[PDB]
Design a protein around this ligand. Structure first.
Ligand SMILES: Cn1cc(Br)c(=O)[nH]c1=O
Lengths: 237, 300
């Protein structure tokens, strides 16, 4: 059924699974019109589809052209997400197709289920975790490829960079969610933390800085302090 | 006006005949029901005084034969069975009518309730939902499961209703996923009406029969089937104008006739609020919506 803290280690067993997050698929800026009314202008979006075991990210860029002439965009976006995930599964060889797909928002369940009727043996599951994948557009290189796209485009990343050479998937996911949780609660500080020491660079083929094990512990600690703080600043405690 | 003669009433039982019912005491001198209006299907049903578990009963049309009820003390129920010798169904009945040991199907002449509940119900279609072909009549009880329920165990004792499933390939055209799931007109009109049921009368007939099985036997899978068939129409943006009007009438008499105390189990909150307030047809069920609001505003 649903995914939560109890069955948390299932993510890192050897059944292929993908998380799908749709929070950045349909993105708008809201503005005033000359007549003083309010209008939206859409900006490019993305589907965040992640294998938590391998780190492979399947970043489907949603170009604003997909919305032209369409009504009820927030609802269409869930169905467009489902179509794109279904197309992605169909393009994978059978031994790469997921056995489960976990949607981060329950509203995706029916759209994906209907788009995946051809795959009765793929379980579509919700989760009770409050996962921070919406902050993915706070990773500069991801935001960059999304804003620059001029057509629909699928871009593949390893969101773990090379971490799996030194740590387990479980620990890799934990770091990732800690970084994203920090970026989500206070983007400015989270980013100040990640780039303070200009001698730690981001490799051209990576998303995050090249920290040593010891430098990651410090970083990780700094992110937890930020997250606790912002929880204080926000509740006064 | 036709007759269903009972051999005898050896056990205390509440007998129903369509929407009527009456108590028969253990070994009361009861020998059947007379004045049954020809031209309709009928249902005769039973709830034992000793075991309110298992309401059961028989769908029949009097024109299809002479039928009578005799208690079987081995199997422990009142069985319907056909009398082929017609000079027996007359002689036996006349003797029991002469001795006035038969209750009178008590139709009020202003009353069209049964006709309105059974308008599209036809025995030939009942006998394909209830598979047992050596009998001109059809047995149903509280516990019988539906073909679709068994998918999600004995097939011979199943209600073979038409399987409806909104998240199925039958219901969803490749490439119209969103269109067809939010507007089921395709599924209703092409797949079900034109394809499976052939016309709206067969559709309405199954709908009506499922409701009556839900109401008279508390058959849970029938109630699912009745709500599913309602929900498919309500969730279709495009429905023939005549189906909508007739649907509003069908539902009105079903809701009118329902026991006011059985609403909690037989009425599915989600389907009704959707049909009446959210669906495409929110504005098309005036009579049904008025009786629902004035009789069960709690549900909504
Ligand atoms: C015992 N019995 C009773 C009826 Br009524 C009938 O018609 N046939 C029969 O054999």
């Amino acid at each position: 059924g649903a995914m939560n803290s109890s069955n948390y280690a299932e993510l890192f067993n050897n059944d292929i699974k993908l998380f799908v997050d749709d929070t950045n698929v349909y993105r708008v800026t809201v503005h005033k019109t000359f007549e003083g009314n309010v209008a939206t202008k859409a900006i490019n979006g993305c589907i965040f589809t992640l294998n938590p075991k391998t780190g492979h990210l399947f970043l489907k860029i949603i170009h604003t052209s997909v919305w032209a002439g369409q009504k009820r965009l927030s609802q269409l976006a869930k169905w467009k997400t489902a179509e794109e995930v279904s197309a992605l599964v169909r393009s994978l060889p059978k031994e790469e197709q997921p056995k489960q797909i976990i949607v981060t928002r329950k509203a995706m369940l029916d759209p994906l289920e209907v788009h995946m009727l051809d795959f009765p043996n793929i379980a579509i599951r919700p989760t009770e975790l409050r996962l921070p994948f919406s902050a993915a557009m706070s990773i500069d290189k991801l935001s960059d490829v999304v804003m620059k796209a001029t057509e629909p485009q699928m871009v593949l990343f390893n969101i773990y960079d090379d971490w799996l050479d030194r740590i387990s998937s479980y620990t890799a996911f934990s770091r990732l969610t800690l970084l994203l949780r920090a970026l989500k609660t206070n983007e400015e500080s989270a980013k100040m933390i990640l780039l303070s020491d200009p001698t730690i660079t981001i490799k051209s083929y990576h998303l995050w800085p090249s920290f040593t094990d010891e430098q990651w512990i410090t970083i990780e600690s700094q992110m937890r302090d930020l997250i606790l703080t912002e929880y204080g600043r926000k509740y006064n405690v | 006006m036709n007759t269903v003669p009972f051999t005898s009433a050896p056990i205390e039982v509440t007998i129903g005949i369509d929407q009527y019912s009456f108590n028969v005491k253990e070994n009361q001198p009861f020998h059947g029901i007379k004045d049954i209006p020809i031209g309709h299907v009928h249902v005769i049903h039973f709830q034992h005084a000793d075991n309110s578990s298992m309401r059961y009963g028989y769908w029949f049309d009097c024109r299809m034969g002479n039928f009578y009820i005799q208690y079987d003390p081995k199997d422990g129920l009142y069985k319907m069975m056909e009398e082929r010798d017609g000079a027996k169904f007359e002689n036996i009945v006349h003797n029991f009518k002469e001795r006035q040991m038969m209750v009178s199907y008590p139709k009020i002449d202003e009353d069209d309730t049964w006709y309105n509940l059974t308008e599209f119900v036809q025995m030939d279609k009942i006998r394909k939902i209830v598979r047992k072909d050596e009998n001109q009549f059809s047995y149903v009880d509280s516990s019988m499961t539906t073909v679709q329920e068994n998918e999600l165990s004995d097939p011979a004792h199943s209600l073979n209703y038409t399987v409806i499933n909104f998240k199925s390939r039958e219901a969803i055209r490749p490439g119209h996923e969103m269109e067809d799931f939010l507007d089921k007109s395709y599924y209703l009109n092409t797949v079900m009406l034109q394809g499976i049921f052939k016309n709206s009368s067969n559709y309405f007939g199954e709908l009506q029969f499922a409701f009556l099985n839900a109401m008279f036997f508390g058959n849970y899978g029938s109630s699912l089937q009745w709500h599913a068939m309602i929900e498919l129409i309500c969730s279709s943006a495009t429905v023939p104008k005549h189906m909508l009007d007739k649907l509003d009438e069908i539902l009105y008499y079903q809701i009118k006739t329902l026991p006011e105390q059985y609403s909690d189990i037989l009425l599915n909150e989600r389907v009704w609020n959707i049909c009446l307030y959210s669906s495409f047809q929110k504005n098309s069920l005036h009579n049904t919506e008025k009786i629902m609001e004035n009789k069960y505003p709690e549900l909504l």
